[PDB]
Amino acid sequence: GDALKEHASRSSRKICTIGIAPWGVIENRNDLVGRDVVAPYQTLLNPLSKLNVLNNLHSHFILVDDGTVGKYGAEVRLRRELEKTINQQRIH
Amino acid sequence: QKSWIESTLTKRECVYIIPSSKDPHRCLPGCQICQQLVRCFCGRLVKQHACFTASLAMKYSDVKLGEHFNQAIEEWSVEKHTEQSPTDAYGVINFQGGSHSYRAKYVRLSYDTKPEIILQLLLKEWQMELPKLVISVHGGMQKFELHPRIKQLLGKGLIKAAVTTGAWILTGGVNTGVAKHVGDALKEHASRSSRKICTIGIAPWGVIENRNDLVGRDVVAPYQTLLNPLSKLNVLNNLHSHFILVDDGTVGKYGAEVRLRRELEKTINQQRIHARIGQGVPVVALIFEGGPNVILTVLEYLQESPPVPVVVCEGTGRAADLLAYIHKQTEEGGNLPDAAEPDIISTIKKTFNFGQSEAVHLFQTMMECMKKKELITVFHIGSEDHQDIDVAILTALLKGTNASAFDQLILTLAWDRVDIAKNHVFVYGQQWLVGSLEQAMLDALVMDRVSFVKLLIENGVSMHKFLTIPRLEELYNTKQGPTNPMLFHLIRDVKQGNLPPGYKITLIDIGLVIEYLMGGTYRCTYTRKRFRLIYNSLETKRFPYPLNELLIWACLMKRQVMARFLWQHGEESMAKALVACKIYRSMAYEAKQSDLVDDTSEELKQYSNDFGQLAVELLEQSFRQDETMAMKLLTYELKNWSNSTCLKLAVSSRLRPFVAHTCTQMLLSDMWMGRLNMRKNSWYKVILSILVPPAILMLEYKTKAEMSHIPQSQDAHQMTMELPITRKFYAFYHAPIVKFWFNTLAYLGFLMLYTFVVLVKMEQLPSVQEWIVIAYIFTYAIEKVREVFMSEAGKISQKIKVWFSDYFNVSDTIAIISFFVGFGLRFGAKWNYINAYDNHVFVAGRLIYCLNIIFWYVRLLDFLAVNQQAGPYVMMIGKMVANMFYIVVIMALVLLSFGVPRKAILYPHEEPSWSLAKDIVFHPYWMIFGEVYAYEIDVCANDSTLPTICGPGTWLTPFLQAVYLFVQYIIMVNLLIAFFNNVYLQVKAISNIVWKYQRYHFIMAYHEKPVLPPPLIILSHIVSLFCCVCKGPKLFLTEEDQKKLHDFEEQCVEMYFDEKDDKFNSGSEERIRVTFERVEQMSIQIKEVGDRVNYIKRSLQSLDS
Ligand SMILES: CCCCCCCC/C=C/CCCCCCCC(=O)O[C@@H](COC(=O)CCCCCCCCCCCCCCC)COP(=O)([O-])OCC[N+](C)(C)C
Ligand SMILES: CCCCCCCC/C=C/CCCCCCCC(=O)O[C@@H](COC(=O)CCCCCCCCCCCCCCC)COP(=O)([O-])OCC[N+](C)(C)C
Ligand SMILES: CCCCCCCC/C=C/CCCCCCCC(=O)O[C@@H](COC(=O)CCCCCCCCCCCCCCC)COP(=O)([O-])OCC[N+](C)(C)C
Ligand SMILES: CCCCCCCC/C=C/CCCCCCCC(=O)O[C@@H](COC(=O)CCCCCCCCCCCCCCC)COP(=O)([O-])OCC[N+](C)(C)C
Ligand SMILES: CCCCCCCC/C=C\CCCCCCCC(=O)O[C@@H](COC(=O)CCCCCCCCCCCCCCC)COP(=O)([O-])OCC[N+](C)(C)C
Ligand SMILES: CCCCCCCC/C=C\CCCCCCCC(=O)O[C@@H](COC(=O)CCCCCCCCCCCCCCC)COP(=O)([O-])OCC[N+](C)(C)C
Ligand SMILES: CCCCCCCC/C=C\CCCCCCCC(=O)O[C@@H](COC(=O)CCCCCCCCCCCCCCC)COP(=O)([O-])OCC[N+](C)(C)C
Ligand SMILES: CCCCCCCC/C=C\CCCCCCCC(=O)O[C@@H](COC(=O)CCCCCCCCCCCCCCC)COP(=O)([O-])OCC[N+](C)(C)C
Ligand SMILES: CCCCCCCC/C=C\CCCCCCCC(=O)O[C@@H](COC(=O)CCCCCCCCCCCCCCC)COP(=O)([O-])OCC[N+](C)(C)C
Ligand SMILES: CCCCCCCC/C=C\CCCCCCCC(=O)O[C@@H](COC(=O)CCCCCCCCCCCCCCC)COP(=O)([O-])OCC[N+](C)(C)C
Ligand SMILES: C[C@@H]1CC[C@@]2(OC1)O[C@H]1C[C@H]3[C@@H]4CC=C5C[C@@H](OCCC(CO)CO)CC[C@]5(C)[C@H]4CC[C@]3(C)[C@H]1[C@@H]2C
Ligand SMILES: CC(C)CCC[C@@H](C)[C@H]1CC[C@H]2[C@@H]3CC=C4C[C@@H](O)CC[C@]4(C)[C@H]3CC[C@]12C
Ligand SMILES: [Ca+2]
């Protein structure tokens, strides 16, 4: 993200950054809920928390869910899927 | 006394005289050389006192008969034995240097002065602003010269941390060592910080040269820079701007002001740095190349309420370098390794020979110091160690108080030092409280600190959660920053004139101002019902678009730099730029329409014309990207701006470069067409289809998808859902192009008839032509009445004043009023039946017709001004008539300078007659147009046609007329040619823009007009009154097209700011100047790597050993 911010506005609408995050370690988790919304979000890192906030410059998010907070190991397989399904498409 | 000083401050006079060592120097007679020598325990000899207790006492012996019992010799304490008396030295010294008469303010006070009194003198009398920092420099004296680089760095850094933090560099004053280096540092970086750094040297009245000269109550007292060839005494230094000349005794005794400096290092600490900030004014200590008693003074600081920290400058000298090494080689906060006393005390020994008796006594003054390392700072010169002392000094007061970062931040906010906040306060690991950055934001917005508002947003402050009602009320009700003093004159003019003394402004009162400055039908978010309820009751108190409420705030408070910040933030950029242009333009008009010392209108109109240009430059950016969506950007309803329109806001501010922009002119071209494609149709076929109705159904219309960027009427948009026959006629007759040509043919047919009625015999009753002609003008007038009612702002007087500002609409009222006078006299008149024109009511009626028709030919220039080529010539004619006025007044004077002598010389025998006002003006005017009256010149000639006018003096007139025409034709007509040639291009450029601008009001007037021209219009009028007692254009987007448009807006603002920097950065002026600055930095480094390698080649023969 910081790398994007240091070289943004020349590659802005050219680089698509998909973070595949779990629905576990995710802050303002209840806020992201809401079907088809312009849902809000913050950048004030929760003074006490071990939890993690989504990052500023990522343009897309795959918020996998199996359980709850913690359990930051259920999206690893899905990332692998998208690392495969793109491989089967012809580049041109 | 006419000086606050004299009533308040004093001096010290050693009233009481005491022996010296008691040895009369030599020379046997002792009684009188006792007078010659004996330095009082004061320190000045008996006769230097001149005191009144001691003036008429030397006659006997002096004070104190005889030996006075050795005990009582040890009793002179100035308190009992030295008197406080009115000042005698306060004024302005003057230094003799190159082009700088450097001034100061000496005071000469007693050391007993209350510390309150001092700060008062400094602030009110010397009119100094309370500092944001105090850099008290403590070092050693006569420290010859620092190394060249280390003088450069301590000379740039002290100046940079004092010019940016408005600081008071407290000094010693003596031109030796510290004050000597401070002063030279000032001189090497003066004239950028000249009237910003206030340097107060607190010097004693002891070691001071030309001491007797500084005496003199309220003087411009002189002073020198020629260092007394023999003297150990010290001279005040050139660049110190103020002086506190403490006095207790005499020369020597350079230790009685040390306590007073400490007072001023305290009294400033108890003042609040800013009206909004609770922190006290900081105080720092700067040690460079000190002394033996420095490390003592250092100790005192770090043991007080609160610990004044210390910034030491190693690499300069002895005490600093000593203090450098010792605290550097210290434990984390404590003792040392296996006893380091052997080297330390040896190190202390060489600077100062002490020798284990008190070289240990230093180790105690040298232990509690290094034990307080957290409060001590050191600038390691030559190691990029915080980038001259400006970082280090300012940093010293943030790291060394174990303070909250709230207070550490706010100090940077009062200092206006964003880099020190972003590099030392917003550093990783920092942990903030719930709403502490908010309180910093509120202070930054009020204090107009844009660069911290940027930072606090960039870190995490959301202006959605931040900005609330009771807060945004405060922001209007502040006096702690740059203010618009007219915002009260406006809030007065809307609230009936009554402002109580308190009157805390309300947002509802601001809404009333924004309605008044934006004019027309504007309804702000604050004046609505839904806000007047939530407001008086007091997420809901949080505004949905906060950066649109603050853009207005920054503008109403005349804060452009904050306005030009908050505008880039948020959405609806082009809209906000045209609002602001309108707010500043109305703020400017109400500033000129008012009485005030600072007009503040050339400031506001420039502010208006700055945002007006932002809108044009974003329109040109959107137009170069997509033309169809850019036209949609001109006509979408805004919904946060009173359902208004970016074009409507530009027309509201007469922002001609936006309406004359090719995008609007092309949308205007497409609204003129209507549903008709005039790219695959011709004007022949539009006229033909008006006269041949069924030819409407053989011409090319436009699809619904070629009409999406075009604002439409509802009924027009309801016939884009289906083209059938009756729909195809509704598309023709309601096009503004068709309403035009359908009115021109009626108007041209109207003049053809009214020309006929006026050239042909006019009988008793009006002919069928003249009835058709009256009907037109009658109904044409009903239309103009309807235009005025159905116009704009509901105030009847406003609609009036707008419509009577156009040239031809004034002509229309004279033309309509004059016609019905003439018809009243024509039709209302008793026909004579012998011969017409024996009735003068009838004649007067006709002659009004014959003159009224001139209005109606000239009105064809309004129809011809619809062409892109013709219309700018029509507007041009009038701009030139106004500009040629004064040339034509001179031509009218040369006329009368000739006609009056001529008529007088040629007609001497005339009684007073109105024919004398014609004959002085008639022939001389027709001469301007080539009629020479050849056979009336020289009336005594044989070919003369005025042979009876020959008489005395008439031979003068041909000479007079020769001069006359030379002036009029050879000078004045050709001066007027020359006028036009040299004003053509700029009136033609203005007239093209005024033409393009008025093409809005014209095209948009032909959407509202009925379909039928002014004879048959009455049907359309009646039908519109039927459906009034029985029952403009808008841009309709579906919700996905609004999405695609807000994207296009955002994407084009990004490309605008991106391409603005990419051009600035890619310019030779920018590439030469950054190249310039890099070659500087390199050259410095090349003569340092060049130095290191010179310290390597020495290490070829040393390693050889
Ligand atoms: C943007 C839109 C703006 C609108 C602006 C509109 C402004 C309109 C402005 C209007 C101003 C009108 C001024 C008219 C002047 C009349 C004077 C006159 O002729 O007097 C003569 C006729 O006197 C009569 O009494 C005649 C009566 C029969 C004829 C009817 C008059 C029609 C008036 C027209 C109505 C116009 C309808 C207006 C419709 C709009 C008197 O002369 P006399 O008879 O020889 O001598 C009498 C003396 N004796 C008795 C001793 C013999
Ligand atoms: C619709 C009817 C059109 C017919 C044309 C009528 C004239 C059209 C007029 C257009 C614009 C010019 C200014 C307005 C004129 C009015 C008086 C005036 O301003 O006086 C000026 C002083 O002038 C004098 O004191 C001398 C006037 C003597 C009058 C002699 C008339 C002789 C013939 C000549 C007439 C024959 C016609 C000449 C046409 C070329 C004061 O002006 P100002 O304070 O310096 O202000 C200038 C503008 N400013 C405010 C931006 C600075
Ligand atoms: C923005 C523009 C505004 C205008 C500004 C300029 C002011 C214009 C004003 C000018 C002054 C005019 C004064 C007229 C005097 C009275 C005339 C009269 O009563 O009857 C005369 C009217 O009939 C005519 O034929 C003469 C009308 C004058 C025409 C003007 C032509 C010169 C242009 C002028 C322009 C240059 C001006 C230079 C500067 C001064 C007829 O003849 P008489 O003998 O007088 O009387 C009848 C007797 N008889 C039957 C025996 C014949
Ligand atoms: C380039 C060519 C020129 C050569 C140079 C030499 C110059 C030659 C001049 C010579 C002067 C003599 C001429 C007049 C002859 C005698 C008297 C006479 O007949 O008078 C006549 C008029 O004329 C006068 O009454 C006087 C005219 C004087 C003006 C001459 C112009 C001065 C030079 C230039 C001035 C420019 C400015 C100067 C500054 C630069 C009488 O005739 P009338 O008028 O028909 O009236 C008679 C009928 N009545 C009795 C009913 C009235
Ligand atoms: C308000 C909206 C108006 C719109 C128009 C609609 C209304 C127009 C419709 C009808 C109005 C006309 C009614 C005519 C009644 C008869 C008159 C009569 O007796 O004889 C006259 C006939 O008529 C003409 O010659 C026409 C007179 C007007 C001239 C202009 C016509 C064109 C303008 C309008 C149309 C063009 C469209 C313009 C578009 C480009 C003259 O007769 P004569 O033979 O010359 O006399 C012999 C002379 N002698 C005695 C010396 C021998
Ligand atoms: C102070 C006077 C009254 C106030 C007038 C103020 C102006 C008001 C405005 C308009 C006036 C209304 C129209 C004309 C009226 C004609 C009257 C007339 O006498 O006509 C005569 C002929 O002439 C006509 O019939 C002319 C018909 C054409 C009129 C043009 C509009 C038609 C378009 C349609 C669209 C809408 C048109 C309407 C829009 C307003 C017939 O009358 P008569 O008696 O048989 O003969 C004459 C007299 N005589 C007997 C002595 C020989
Ligand atoms: C709101 C706008 C302003 C309106 C102003 C008011 C307008 C109305 C004004 C006036 C009302 C009309 C007066 C009636 C006539 C009375 C005399 C009479 O009976 O007839 C006599 C008329 O003698 C004349 O001198 C007539 C002159 C009329 C023209 C003057 C008005 C010009 C208006 C300026 C233009 C303004 C245009 C609009 C500008 C925007 C003679 O005729 P007689 O009697 O049949 O017979 C002979 C008898 N006798 C020889 C013994 C005498
Ligand atoms: C029954 C009746 C039968 C039919 C009647 C027929 C009647 C004929 C009627 C009119 C004649 C003109 C026809 C040409 C039109 C060309 C096209 C056009 O629109 O051009 C322009 C004219 O725009 C106007 O508004 C012109 C108005 C003309 C009226 C003034 C008359 C002058 C008289 C004074 C002279 C005195 C002498 C008068 C004689 C005594 C506008 O176009 P534009 O804005 O440039 O838009 C195109 C831009 N583009 C090129 C980029 C795409
Ligand atoms: C009988 C029939 C004759 C022929 C009919 C001809 C019909 C007419 C033909 C063409 C008309 C031209 C169209 C005008 C276009 C709009 C201009 C406008 O609004 O105002 C313009 C000014 O004001 C004027 O220009 C006033 C109108 C000028 C007409 C000239 C009359 C001169 C005659 C009188 C002398 C006669 C001497 C003799 C006296 C007896 C705009 O000016 P500006 O610069 O934008 O702003 C002004 C402010 N400033 C001063 C600060 C700059
Ligand atoms: C340009 C530089 C200077 C040079 C000027 C040269 C000077 C010129 C030379 C000489 C002076 C003019 C007189 C010479 C002609 C006399 C002949 C004569 O009788 O003429 C006439 C009278 O005329 C007079 O009586 C005119 C008297 C002097 C006029 C005022 C000076 C003019 C000079 C202005 C200078 C402007 C300077 C402006 C400065 C920039 C005709 O008289 P009459 O009809 O025969 O008499 C019988 C009549 N009765 C029958 C009714 C009884
Ligand atoms: C600064 C400029 C200097 C030049 C000038 O403008 C101002 O000064 C003005 C003064 C005007 C005269 C004033 C008085 C009258 C009397 C009147 O007597 C009617 C008698 C009878 C009719 O037979 C009544 O029944 C006739 C007209 C006349 C001579 C004026 C003429 C024009 C003059 C000279 C004007 C000229 C243009
Ligand atoms: C001194 C008076 C009584 C005699 C008549 C004056 C003359 C000069 C008047 C009579 C009617 C006048 C015209 C009437 C109508 C118009 C149309 C207008 O848009 C410009 C001025 C203009 C073109 C006028 C110019 C001056 C005019 C021609
Ligand atoms: Ca000619």
PDB file of N, CA and C in Angstrom, chain B residues 93-126:
ATOM      1  N   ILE B  93      20.078  52.975  20.646  1.00  0.00           N
ATOM      2  CA  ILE B  93      21.435  53.063  20.127  1.00  0.00           C
ATOM      3  C   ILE B  93      21.422  52.910  18.607  1.00  0.00           C
ATOM      4  N   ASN B  94      22.576  53.175  18.006  1.00  0.00           N
ATOM      5  CA  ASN B  94      22.743  53.130  16.563  1.00  0.00           C
ATOM      6  C   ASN B  94      24.159  52.668  16.258  1.00  0.00           C
ATOM      7  N   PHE B  95      24.267  51.654  15.404  1.00  0.00           N
ATOM      8  CA  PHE B  95      25.538  51.038  15.055  1.00  0.00           C
ATOM      9  C   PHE B  95      26.003  51.537  13.697  1.00  0.00           C
ATOM     10  N   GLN B  96      27.320  51.639  13.543  1.00  0.00           N
ATOM     11  CA  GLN B  96      27.935  52.196  12.341  1.00  0.00           C
ATOM     12  C   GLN B  96      28.449  51.039  11.495  1.00  0.00           C
ATOM     13  N   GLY B  97      27.608  50.590  10.563  1.00  0.00           N
ATOM     14  CA  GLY B  97      27.896  49.448   9.724  1.00  0.00           C
ATOM     15  C   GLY B  97      27.387  49.696   8.321  1.00  0.00           C
ATOM     16  N   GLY B  98      27.658  48.741   7.434  1.00  0.00           N
ATOM     17  CA  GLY B  98      27.290  48.920   6.045  1.00  0.00           C
ATOM     18  C   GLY B  98      25.790  48.964   5.840  1.00  0.00           C
ATOM     19  N   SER B  99      25.274  50.177   5.651  1.00  0.00           N
ATOM     20  CA  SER B  99      23.903  50.484   5.246  1.00  0.00           C
ATOM     21  C   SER B  99      22.870  50.095   6.290  1.00  0.00           C
ATOM     22  N   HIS B 100      23.303  49.655   7.465  1.00  0.00           N
ATOM     23  CA  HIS B 100      22.421  49.235   8.537  1.00  0.00           C
ATOM     24  C   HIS B 100      22.776  50.065   9.759  1.00  0.00           C
ATOM     25  N   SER B 101      21.822  50.871  10.210  1.00  0.00           N
ATOM     26  CA  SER B 101      22.002  51.738  11.363  1.00  0.00           C
ATOM     27  C   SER B 101      21.600  51.052  12.651  1.00  0.00           C
ATOM     28  N   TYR B 102      21.824  49.727  12.741  1.00  0.00           N
ATOM     29  CA  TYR B 102      21.128  48.772  13.606  1.00  0.00           C
ATOM     30  C   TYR B 102      20.704  49.384  14.932  1.00  0.00           C
ATOM     31  N   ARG B 103      19.439  49.228  15.291  1.00  0.00           N
ATOM     32  CA  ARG B 103      18.863  49.934  16.419  1.00  0.00           C
ATOM     33  C   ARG B 103      18.712  48.977  17.590  1.00  0.00           C
ATOM     34  N   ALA B 104      18.360  49.529  18.744  1.00  0.00           N
ATOM     35  CA  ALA B 104      18.056  48.703  19.898  1.00  0.00           C
ATOM     36  C   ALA B 104      17.231  49.502  20.893  1.00  0.00           C
ATOM     37  N   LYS B 105      17.046  48.945  22.088  1.00  0.00           N
ATOM     38  CA  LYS B 105      16.256  49.592  23.133  1.00  0.00           C
ATOM     39  C   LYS B 105      16.925  49.274  24.472  1.00  0.00           C
ATOM     40  N   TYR B 106      17.814  50.165  24.896  1.00  0.00           N
ATOM     41  CA  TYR B 106      18.446  50.063  26.203  1.00  0.00           C
ATOM     42  C   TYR B 106      17.522  50.658  27.260  1.00  0.00           C
ATOM     43  N   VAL B 107      17.637  50.156  28.497  1.00  0.00           N
ATOM     44  CA  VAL B 107      16.706  50.493  29.571  1.00  0.00           C
ATOM     45  C   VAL B 107      17.415  51.000  30.827  1.00  0.00           C
ATOM     46  N   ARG B 108      18.504  50.345  31.246  1.00  0.00           N
ATOM     47  CA  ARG B 108      19.187  50.726  32.489  1.00  0.00           C
ATOM     48  C   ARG B 108      18.294  50.628  33.720  1.00  0.00           C
ATOM     49  N   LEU B 109      18.038  49.415  34.199  1.00  0.00           N
ATOM     50  CA  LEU B 109      17.234  49.213  35.397  1.00  0.00           C
ATOM     51  C   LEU B 109      18.079  48.689  36.547  1.00  0.00           C
ATOM     52  N   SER B 110      17.562  48.884  37.759  1.00  0.00           N
ATOM     53  CA  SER B 110      18.132  48.264  38.945  1.00  0.00           C
ATOM     54  C   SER B 110      17.813  46.775  38.974  1.00  0.00           C
ATOM     55  N   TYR B 111      18.729  45.987  39.540  1.00  0.00           N
ATOM     56  CA  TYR B 111      18.547  44.540  39.569  1.00  0.00           C
ATOM     57  C   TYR B 111      17.418  44.098  40.502  1.00  0.00           C
ATOM     58  N   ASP B 112      16.821  45.029  41.250  1.00  0.00           N
ATOM     59  CA  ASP B 112      15.767  44.716  42.206  1.00  0.00           C
ATOM     60  C   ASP B 112      14.376  44.743  41.592  1.00  0.00           C
ATOM     61  N   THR B 113      14.257  45.219  40.347  1.00  0.00           N
ATOM     62  CA  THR B 113      12.988  45.313  39.631  1.00  0.00           C
ATOM     63  C   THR B 113      12.177  44.028  39.736  1.00  0.00           C
ATOM     64  N   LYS B 114      10.879  44.164  39.996  1.00  0.00           N
ATOM     65  CA  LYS B 114      10.004  43.007  40.082  1.00  0.00           C
ATOM     66  C   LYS B 114       9.967  42.311  38.727  1.00  0.00           C
ATOM     67  N   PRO B 115       9.936  40.978  38.681  1.00  0.00           N
ATOM     68  CA  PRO B 115       9.990  40.308  37.375  1.00  0.00           C
ATOM     69  C   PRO B 115       8.751  40.543  36.524  1.00  0.00           C
ATOM     70  N   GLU B 116       7.626  40.919  37.140  1.00  0.00           N
ATOM     71  CA  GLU B 116       6.448  41.325  36.378  1.00  0.00           C
ATOM     72  C   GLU B 116       6.745  42.567  35.547  1.00  0.00           C
ATOM     73  N   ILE B 117       7.410  43.550  36.159  1.00  0.00           N
ATOM     74  CA  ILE B 117       7.677  44.840  35.526  1.00  0.00           C
ATOM     75  C   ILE B 117       8.452  44.652  34.229  1.00  0.00           C
ATOM     76  N   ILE B 118       9.399  43.716  34.230  1.00  0.00           N
ATOM     77  CA  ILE B 118      10.285  43.517  33.083  1.00  0.00           C
ATOM     78  C   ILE B 118       9.477  43.075  31.875  1.00  0.00           C
ATOM     79  N   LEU B 119       8.720  41.988  32.042  1.00  0.00           N
ATOM     80  CA  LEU B 119       7.911  41.444  30.958  1.00  0.00           C
ATOM     81  C   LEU B 119       6.943  42.481  30.415  1.00  0.00           C
ATOM     82  N   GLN B 120       6.449  43.360  31.283  1.00  0.00           N
ATOM     83  CA  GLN B 120       5.561  44.425  30.844  1.00  0.00           C
ATOM     84  C   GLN B 120       6.282  45.367  29.885  1.00  0.00           C
ATOM     85  N   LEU B 121       7.426  45.917  30.315  1.00  0.00           N
ATOM     86  CA  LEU B 121       8.286  46.728  29.452  1.00  0.00           C
ATOM     87  C   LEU B 121       8.515  46.066  28.102  1.00  0.00           C
ATOM     88  N   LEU B 122       8.884  44.786  28.129  1.00  0.00           N
ATOM     89  CA  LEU B 122       9.178  44.061  26.901  1.00  0.00           C
ATOM     90  C   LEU B 122       7.967  44.033  25.979  1.00  0.00           C
ATOM     91  N   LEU B 123       6.780  43.798  26.541  1.00  0.00           N
ATOM     92  CA  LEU B 123       5.594  43.564  25.722  1.00  0.00           C
ATOM     93  C   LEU B 123       4.884  44.856  25.313  1.00  0.00           C
ATOM     94  N   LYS B 124       4.550  45.734  26.268  1.00  0.00           N
ATOM     95  CA  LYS B 124       3.726  46.901  25.935  1.00  0.00           C
ATOM     96  C   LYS B 124       4.566  48.087  25.461  1.00  0.00           C
ATOM     97  N   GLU B 125       5.641  48.408  26.182  1.00  0.00           N
ATOM     98  CA  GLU B 125       6.416  49.605  25.876  1.00  0.00           C
ATOM     99  C   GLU B 125       7.245  49.401  24.620  1.00  0.00           C
ATOM    100  N   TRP B 126       8.035  48.337  24.595  1.00  0.00           N
ATOM    101  CA  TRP B 126       8.802  47.971  23.419  1.00  0.00           C
ATOM    102  C   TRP B 126       7.942  47.288  22.359  1.00  0.00           C
TER     103      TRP B 126
END
